[PDB]
């Protein structure tokens, strides 16, 4: 087998969108009614393995579809070796439908210190500046 | 009380990188080691409420800070009316540190008919034409 998202581009079936660097699909497994993915043409595993020159224009599609969709609620959510199926970037557009047909997330925040948070800061400084 | 990122912003402490168009925060109450936000400095509650002018350079940014940071492993996510807290879009950038310290999602996918799928197809095309 190859790339599920190169041989479905290359077979150009069902494509609901297209520009010059990306095309989009409707999920065939969705989450909720409407779940749709903005797929870069270009193949690369994760976010940061593109130049920008690849990911032109993904957000400005995506906002595109939602209005063309009617979809005011809604969650973008991409996949960097974490819950990733599929080993070409693509951007998951998941509309709120209902509480029990939505994108789900179990999100079990950790609170910091004030310190623990002032250390992590500089951190990042740290490392913005290298 | 007004908007937590405007107020932020406004203040300027503990900005960890600034573009034009936009700012990074590390969040104070992370999902995961190093989770941090990509911020736009213009307010609006949606990601559709945005023209591509307040929203330059998102994934660029994102990026440039995971290879900052180091994180090979990470999830990218924006919400807009589902999991929302606060209305001025933010695109949380969410490390993979280990099976207990990550964005954890419930994935509940549905299944269709090909003819459920030819007709999602066809309507999608549908609303891309009107
Ligand atoms: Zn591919
Ligand atoms: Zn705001």
Known sequence: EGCIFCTLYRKGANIIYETDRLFALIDRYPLSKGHFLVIPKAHHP??????????????????????????????????????QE??????????????????????????????????MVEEARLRVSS
Do not use: C
Not at 54 to 67: A, F, M, P
Not at 89 to 117: C, G, Q, T
């Open 46 to 83: 994760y976010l940061h393995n593109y130049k920008p020159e690849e990911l032109s224009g993904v957000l400005d599609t995506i906002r595109h579809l939602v209005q063309k969709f009617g979809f005011e609620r809604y969650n973008i959510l991409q996949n960097n070796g974490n819950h």
């Open 86 to 119: 599929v080993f070409h970037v693509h951007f998951h557009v998941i509309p709120f439908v209902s509480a029990d047909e939505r994108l789900m997330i179990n999100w079990k925040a950790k609170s910091v210190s004030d310190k623990e948070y002032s250390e």
